[PDB]
Each structure stands twice: as C-alpha cells, then as structure tokens.
Design an enzyme around this catalytic site. Sequence first.
Site, PDB file in Angstrom:
ATOM      1  N   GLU A   1      41.636  29.073  63.898  1.00 18.86           N
ATOM      2  CA  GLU A   1      41.225  30.537  63.644  1.00 18.86           C
ATOM      3  C   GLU A   1      41.756  31.073  62.316  1.00 18.86           C
ATOM      4  O   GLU A   1      41.068  31.740  61.301  1.00 18.86           O
ATOM      5  CB  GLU A   1      41.517  31.354  64.748  1.00 18.86           C
TER       6      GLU A   1
ATOM      7  N   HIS B   1      23.619  25.923  74.399  1.00 17.70           N
ATOM      8  CA  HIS B   1      22.891  26.069  73.191  1.00 17.70           C
ATOM      9  C   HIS B   1      21.695  26.018  73.436  1.00 17.70           C
ATOM     10  O   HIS B   1      20.654  26.569  72.593  1.00 17.70           O
ATOM     11  CB  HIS B   1      23.577  24.823  72.276  1.00 17.70           C
TER      12      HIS B   1
END
Lengths: 597, 195
Positions: free
Chosen positions: A357, A487
């Site tokens: 991150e 997805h």
Amino acid sequence: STIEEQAKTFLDKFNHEAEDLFYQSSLASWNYNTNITEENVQNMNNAGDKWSAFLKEQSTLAQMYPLQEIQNLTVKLQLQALQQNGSSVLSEDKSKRLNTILNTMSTIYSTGKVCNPDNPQECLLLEPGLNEIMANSLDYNERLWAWESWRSEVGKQLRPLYEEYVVLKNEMARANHYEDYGDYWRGDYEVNGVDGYDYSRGQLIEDVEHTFEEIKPLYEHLHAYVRAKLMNAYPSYISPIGCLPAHLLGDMWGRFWTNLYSLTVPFGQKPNIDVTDAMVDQAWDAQRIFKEAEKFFVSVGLPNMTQGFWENSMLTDPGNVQKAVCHPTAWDLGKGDFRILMCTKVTMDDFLTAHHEMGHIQYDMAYAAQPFLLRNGANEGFHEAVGEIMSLSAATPKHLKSIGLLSPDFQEDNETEINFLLKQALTIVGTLPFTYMLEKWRWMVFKGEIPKDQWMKKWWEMKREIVGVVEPVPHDETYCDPASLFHVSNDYSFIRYYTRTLYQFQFQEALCQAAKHEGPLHKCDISNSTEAGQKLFNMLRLGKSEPWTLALENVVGAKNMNVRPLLNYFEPLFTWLKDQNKNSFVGWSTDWSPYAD
Amino acid sequence: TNLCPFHEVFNATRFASVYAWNRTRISNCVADYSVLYNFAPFFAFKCYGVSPTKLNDLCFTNVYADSFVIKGNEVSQIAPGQTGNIADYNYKLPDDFTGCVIAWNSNKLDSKHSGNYDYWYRLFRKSKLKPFERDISTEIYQAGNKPCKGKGPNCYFPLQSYGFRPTYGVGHQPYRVVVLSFELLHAPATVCGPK
C-alpha cells in the site's frame, strides 16, 4: 483565432470545475466506508449523481473540437477521452434494464448462502464457512459437497441474465464503432500517432500466445510434483496420469495453490521463517510497522509521508459498534490528501500488505503534478508491479536480519532456498494459466463464436487442455460456473494480473543490475541504493502523459514484454524438479475422469 | 513617540481578495517591525535590494502596503521575472523592485468546512498587466470569433473561486501575503527608524 486555444481554455476550466466536486464525492465515499450509516449512503449517492450529471453536461460539448485539426498530443489525449459517448448512446429503457440486471447479479452474489440438504436448519455462508472449509478441510466427500452445492445453488440463477448482459454490451460496443466489448477492453493498450511505438489491439493476442509457450515446461514439472504429492496425500482418489480434481486445489476456483505448501513441503523438518513470535515478544504495533516501511522508501531517496497521513488514516479496527469494511485500499482524494484504510494486525502478511500500500501511495503521489485527466498510471499493472517488487525486496532474509528480527545464528542452506522458491512458485506460476484460459474464453464468448449450447462444454475442454483439471461431477447448460466468480460477475478484467506478473520481474532485474548486485537474483536487495530510486522516479513522474512502451524502454531498455527474467529467477527450482521427476510421468491424460471409472 | 498602524492590516478579519487587492499608504510614523512576531513569529521573511539590518537606519517618504490571499504553490510567482496566471493577470511586480515579502499560514482562520467561496481570482484576460496595475472588469471573455450574447459556448466567466477546506494539503492551504514598497521623492521625509 485557432481551435487549439479554445480547447486549451476549455480544458483549463474543466479541470478546476471537476476537481471540487470530486473532493466532495471522494470525501463522501471515505466517510461512508469508515462508518456505515443510512445518512452516509444517501450523501454518497447524491454526490455521485451530481458528479455524473456534471460529466454528462461536460461531455457532448467538446464535440465542437475535431481531433483531425489538433497537433499537440498533450491536448489531443485529453480531448479523445471526453468524446467517448459511453452508454449514453443506448435508449433509456435498455440502460435502465442493464443497470437493474447488474444490481440484481451483484445482490445475488453478495447474498448467496448454502444449507444442508439433510438439515435445512443448518446453513453456512461463503466467506466465513466455505473458505475455511476449502482451506483446512481434508475429507473428500465434504469438499466435493462444498464445491457442488454452492455452484448448483448460485450459478444456475445468473445464467439467463448473463446472456442479456452480453447482448447489451455487444450492442453498446458496436454502437461506438467497436467490433465488440473485448475490443473495447483491449483499447487500454492501443497507441497511435508515434512512429516506432505504435501498438495494435490484435498484436496483444499474438504476444500473449508467443509468451505462454515458454512457460509450459516449468508448469509441467510443477504439475508432476504436485500430482506425486497428492497421490500419497489422497490414495485411491488420485490417478497416476489423470487430471487433478478441482476441489483439491485448496480453494473454490483453483486460482492459488498456496494452500498446498503443507502437503508439498519437501523438507518438512527444516525450520520455516516466521518472525511473528519475535514481533509479539518485542510488542510491536502498527505505527512501528509503518515507520519501518517508510524508512525503506527513505533509504532509496523517496519523499516522506505527509503530516495528514497519520492524522486522517485508519490503521486499527475500532472494535466497537462501528462497522467498517476491512479491505486494504489506497485512497487519493486530491488536493494533497492521501489516506489508507486497513484493519492492520500483527502479522508478516500485514507487513507485506503495508509495504504494498505504501508503494501504491508513492506512485499516486509521484504524478500529482500532471493534469487531472492524466493523473493515472500509464498501464493497469504498473501499480501492482511497483507494489509487489517492494514486497519481494523486503521478504529477503537479509532485510529481516538487518533490522534485528532474525537472530544472526540463522544459517542459510540449499533446502531453505528451495522451499522459498517453491512457495513463491505455488503462488505466482499457478494463476497464469487460469487467468489466460479465463480471459481467452471470455473474449471468444464476447466475439460470438461459441453458441450458447457449447459454453460449459468448451469451458471444461479448455480446462483439461491447458490447466489439466477435470471436474468431479458433470454439468449441463443449467449450471453457470464462470458466473460464480467475483471479477466475472462484477464486470472486471483479468489480463492486468498477467501483465503485472510479467513486468515485475523485468523491473526487479533492472533495479538489481543498477545496484550492481551479485549472485542469485532472489537474494537481491535495493536498500540504500539511490541510483535505482532516481531511475524509478524518472518514470513514475510520466504517468498518462507518454506511452507505456517509451517508459518501459527508458526503464529496462526494451519495448515488448519478455519472460526470460522469470525463467532466470526460477532456474534453481526448475533444475531441482528434474531430479525428482526423473522417475515420474510427464503430461496428463484428457480422457480419464473421477466419475468415469 | 508615535507608532505606525501596522497592527491593523495584520489583525483584520477580511484580507482583500487578490482580484481586488487593497492598497494603503503609511506616512508620518515610526515603523516597529518587532510587532510582527506577536501575530506570527514564524515568518517567510525575504527582501530584495535591501537588508533588514540597514533598513533600521534609513528614511523614506511614503510606504505602500499591499495584501491578498493565495495558495501555497503560487507564492513562488510573487517575485521579479516570474510568470503564471497570478503574476500575469492579477498582480505583477516590475523587473526592478526594492521591498520585502511576508507570508504566513492562516488555515484554521480562513478555512471552513463546506468550502469558503468568499475568495475569487482571475484566470482569463486578453493581455497581460503592467507593473502595479489593477482591473475590476466583470465583462464576459470572448474566445471565438462570434459576438458575446451571454454565457455559453466559447463564453466563460472570467472569475472563479478557490474553496479552501481545513483538510487540504499544505500546498493548497490559504496563505496571507503582504508586500511593502519603499518610495523616495523630492519632499520632506516622514518615516524613519528608531534610535
């Protein structure tokens, strides 16, 4: 006067008009995700509606500026984006029905559940129950039931809606002069107007086909080793030459094989590396982890974190009536406001996720100076690759040893490196064939070359052909297994992961050669190296302003993707697997099936 | 002894939006720069063509004080030989200048939730401004070759708002700037330094 100046002033006004309304909407989404309430949902919906209305009125206006007259690509790229009509070309009824279908499928996915046939009172859910089962369970019938019931219950409901979804998407694509929705998806790699760097959407398929051929050798040996292990792990169920049952891949879909480490660990008696105990003994916290991560990026010459980063970010689960969505994400609200949302807890995986991150945040901060429409990554997989290279560099024993976590008494050996490489391969090499097959099937379906009466048949055919996996129970056209994936149901792409996996190794090799590393590649460490940091920053500042080809050429000195770095990285494991497979069979039979005998 | 009214411009609530920057003349008083530390000790002190030490024993006829609010990134445009929207359309200094520039942070003062749209600035103009020029025109700007008939295509309003928030990055927070110009003329001096 000229049209160029008109377009320039129009874009200058649009940037300032859009920045604010974004800040509002971005702040609203953050406030919602940080504290789930009824008022925040309404506020976020209002802000999103206002943003959409703003984009609607801003679009349909730039049509007065033909692209054939513009010459400076900087303005041409900004103008080409706004001219996209999008779904607005469809009629109101069709768009409304499409949105309703999307919402219904999302609700079905997020609300699915399972109950015991012999005990309807006993019911379970996917996230808490099925994941834990597929992870820790060891029974055959239990895993078979967990694999069959969820599909039979959920996929059979999304089958009819998916056909109308595909039809509407193809109509919308052909409305915008595209050949199909797959051609629209592949538009992110298109490049024109620059000699020596042009790229077509069709050449991508050729490149993928050419690259996939070089990976089959290592995958065959890995499959042979995994099969040899499973035959001892589950006798009387595994065939010596047949395909592996899908329900034994440690997960519901078979995307990652990391769960098989406990059964495939060659040297089970060696001490595995896990600093969790040392971290618990030293009583570390989230701030310590994030500061140790920031020091890594500071050692290479990158900027420090902002002051508001620590004041506004959420790094700990409140653990109260307040409920938040625990999912690592990086937020960029603009105006110099950067924040992170993560339910951090003491664990090595959390350390690597924090590194990832922070790497994402560094990239986001790099191109903050470019125009609004250009403040984005040149490619989809670049962010993930930049985030994963940092985790790779940090996961080395040398880095952990320099920070005093690992005692110096630890000695390296061949077995430790073999285990590390095998653990990395089980995660990295396993997803490439599945992703490739899924994306190819999706493209072929969107292209219309597969009638509805062959979808599930070709699915299993390509499965057994490429991945070499056979289903334990035969299914008919009533079932829809591809729709049982996030997805696939949420309208997301897959090739980005393949591109990132290919680019990360090239980036790593280049950065390690820059630092004059020696010896094996998996022992590289870029800490305390400013040359690599400067070389990377020279590219992180480009953003959407230049083609990805030029950036990749400036970084690694090459234009097209290459797989040689991955092979050089995994050479030791590829050499070791031969000594074990010498007495084993290679390949798999496409005829055998668990229910055929 | 008679001190100058410096404490006024440094303590006022409103701060003379850039597009209408105010000008005040200071004369017949003793300038005491030690009071600036009462408002904000931390300052961005900087001078051109003169030093703060030799400034304490000089005399001048009149002193002009200018004030306005701008972002942090645009503070670099307030200097000779600079370019940009602010330097070209709002406030321009001459190539030859003798004075000092003062800047301090005023986020918690001027910033407010829901945005503070009370400050405006100019970004469109037909030509650049000359040194020390002011313009308060509000007519619509024409970008195309057609006559103006109200807001619409190729017709944009020449004014816009900032919208400061307390949760902005340091680069976008509001900054209060003061400019001091020293003038000399064939007349009896009225401003000098203490003894």
